């Protein structure tokens, strides 16, 4: 409880709200879901000046992502979609369209903002641990146990980011991850120690 509040305070120094009109209540809801991430990761994002940019329009309408216009994202071959159509981006930066959090809103992630921020934590905070020998060994065994095996089962950074989202979204998804991917669950549990 008190830690959730602390995590919301840290996020207040990371989240950037869009200019102009936007769904203020849903933006708060996205922040609240992000506040379930372990404070150690949130503090490290804050320390690295990582901004979580919430958007009211397309990602590629932003100046820093205009270069992605027409580009088909990794693993999105055959969808007929380009970055212009994608509601979230993670890695060295984070940009998220408000209202598109849930599975089915232009994506099939368990949660948009947790998947994207997980990739920023992987890349910025954990120095691409998803591509380390230890996680590759876990990915080889359990990478195909969360579905979407042509995406999660092929890119270890994507399996990491989606598993991280399962771990932190809520108690239900946390339980599902432990049952499907026990080694991954233990790996994430030790990472937060």
């Amino acid at each position: 409880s008190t830690t959730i509040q602390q995590n919301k305070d840290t996020l207040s120094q990371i989240v950037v709200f869009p200019t102009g009109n936007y769904d203020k209540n849903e933006a708060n809801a996205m922040v609240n879901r992000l506040a379930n991430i372990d404070g150690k990761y949130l503090n490290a994002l804050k320390q690295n000046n990582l901004k979580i940019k919430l958007l009211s329009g397309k990602l590629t309408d932003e100046k820093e992502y205009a270069y992605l216009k027409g580009v088909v994202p990794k693993g999105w071959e055959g969808t007929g979609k380009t970055w212009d159509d994608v509601p979230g981006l993670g890695g060295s930066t984070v940009a998220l369209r408000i209202g598109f959090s849930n599975k089915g809103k232009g994506h099939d992630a368990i949660n948009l903002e947790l998947h994207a921020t997980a990739h920023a934590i992987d890349h910025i905070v954990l120095n691409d641990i998803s591509k380390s020998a230890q996680f590759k060994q876990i990915f080889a065994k359990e990478g195909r146990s969360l579905g979407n095996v042509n995406f999660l089962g092929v890119y270890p950074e994507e399996f990491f980011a989606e598993s991280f989202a399962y771990y932190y979204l809520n108690q239900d998804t946390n339980s599902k991850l432990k049952s499907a991917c026990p080694q991954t669950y233990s790996f994430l549990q030790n990472l937060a120690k």
Partner: peptide
């Protein structure tokens, strides 16, 4: 580095 959500 940029990565998308699950398709």
């Amino acid at each position: 580095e940029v990565a998308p959500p699950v398709p």
